[PDB]
């Protein structure tokens, strides 16, 4: 028989194909909306600074909410407290990197381990490149390279993150589930900095590489990835 | 049925079209293009008729066999590879053969062949080289050119013509083709003063001159 079963097979196939097409359109429109939002955010600071200058006052921009941290010292001879903080920040290997959202706790935690890390405020392009090139997902306690959107969609579907654009937007804007997104994100393994470092041991202010560099972390990332 | 129209968008960049999805939906006029829903042969025999089965089963299977291969897409046979040519090489340019039996002989270049090899010849009347093929990598292209846009070379010569056979005897067809090409090439190079002697000479490196310094 199966005169109906055979057509039902392809009916199910067509339904699945239409569902996939709808999902693709959804993520495409969401990416377009994210691009619009990024442009709006970029122009808003310029507008506010311009109006403040025109009025003669000053416009202090909001303190950055997202930071990128790279471990720049080895495993040998580490104080136990610094070792514990590095373990908590998930920097167990030299030239590992991760994103950290900022608050009092994060500030003090980073201050404890200033000599061992170089951290700064990542740029949108830096986030994009880091996610696309070095970004691997932690699925089933396994380091899986993110080569398809379904891998992201399963691990973060309940948080309405369904593709690379959602992941990047949520990381860059520090969304409501930034903790879940960042934890799903495996720590980045960056190559050695092409062109060399200035001086690993000392602080960035005194001509070294350790400590906080506000936006030079983007210059560092460009050569470390 | 239906004559195959050309693509409606010029290639902006490789893999990216000039017009978007909606512009294409308009240009294709798809708003009015909606659509909706062997192995046996009978033969006579002198008995009766026999249903002979072509594609019969093999009479020997090997002890063991290798499995199939996984499928790959970007790999194409050498026949349909895209052919590249250096910018400095144009018809009528002087080349310096670097690796053949004709080491360092200045030779006039005529045409790019189908498999990528250069069809080259300096009239063997003066520098002693016939119609020949040469890989574009193994030649130095100097910046001296003659005008051969107004010469005709036979269409019958090709890679199948120049393919090696099997003592090698030159054929009368080879001789007549060489004469036909050189009878037009030679007057062009004789117009330029001191060019025949230049082609007769042989390139070489003496002490104190270095290729990265000297220009050609």
């Amino acid at each position: 028989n199966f005169a109906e079963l055979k057509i039902k097979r392809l009916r199910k196939k067509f339904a699945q194909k239409m569902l996939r097409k709808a999902r693709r359109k959804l993520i495409y429109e969401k990416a377009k909306h994210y691009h619009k939002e990024y442009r709006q955010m970029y122009r808003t600071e310029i507008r506010m600074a311009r109006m403040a200058r025109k009025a003669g006052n000053f416009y202090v921009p909001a303190e950055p909410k997202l930071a990128f941290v790279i471990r720049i010292r080895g495993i040998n001879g580490v104080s136990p407290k610094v070792r514990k903080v590095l373990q908590l920040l998930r920097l167990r290997q030299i030239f590992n990197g991760t994103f950290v959202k900022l608050n009092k706790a994060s500030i003090n935690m980073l201050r404890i381990v200033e000599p061992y890390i170089a951290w700064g405020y990542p740029n949108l392009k830096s986030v994009n490149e880091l996610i696309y090139k070095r970004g691997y997902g932690k699925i089933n306690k396994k380091r899986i390279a993110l080569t398809d959107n379904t891998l992201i969609a399963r691990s973060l579907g309940k948080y309405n993150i369904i593709c690379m654009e959602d992941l990047i937007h949520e990381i860059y804007t520090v969304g409501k589930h930034f903790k879940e997104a960042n934890n799903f994100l495996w720590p980045f393994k960056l190559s050695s900095p092409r062109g060399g470092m200035k001086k690993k041991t000392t602080h960035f202010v005194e001509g070294g590489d350790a400590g906080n560099r506000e936006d030079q972390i983007n210059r560092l990332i460009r050569r470390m990835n | 049925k239906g004559k195959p129209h050309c693509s409606r968008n010029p290639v902006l960049v490789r893999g990216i079209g000039r017009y978007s999805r909606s512009a294409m939906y308009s240009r294709k006029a798809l708003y009015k293009r909606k659509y909706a829903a062997l192995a046996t042969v009978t033969k006579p025999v002198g008995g009766g008729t026999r249903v002979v089965k072509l594609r019969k089963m093999p009479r020997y299977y090997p002890t063991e066999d290798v499995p199939r291969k996984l499928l790959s897409h970007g790999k194409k046979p050498f026949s349909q590879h895209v052919r590249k040519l250096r910018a400095s090489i144009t018809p009528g340019t002087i080349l310096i053969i670097l690796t053949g039996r004709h080491r360092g002989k200045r030779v006039v270049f005529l045409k790019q062949l189908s498999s990528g090899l250069l069809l080259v010849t300096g009239p063997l009347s003066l520098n002693r080289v016939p119609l020949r093929r040469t890989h574009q990598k193994f030649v130095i292209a100097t910046s001296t050119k003659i005008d051969i846009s107004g010469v005709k070379i036979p269409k019958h010569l090709t890679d199948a013509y120049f393919k090696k056979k099997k003592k090698y005897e030159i054929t009368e067809q080879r001789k007549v083709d060489q004469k036909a090409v050189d009878s037009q090439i030679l007057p062009k190079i004789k117009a330029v003063p001191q060019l025949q002697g230049y082609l007769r000479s042989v390139f070489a490196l003496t002490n104190g001159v270095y290729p990265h310094k000297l220009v050609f």
Binding site: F14, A15, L19 | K34, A36
Partner: peptide, 19 residues
């Protein structure tokens, strides 16, 4: 529409409309 459950009828609608 992209929701597998509530978007089934809308998906059917657009699929039939394409015809």
């Amino acid at each position: 529409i992209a929701h597998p459950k509530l978007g089934r009828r809308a998906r059917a609608r657009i699929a039939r409309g394409l015809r």
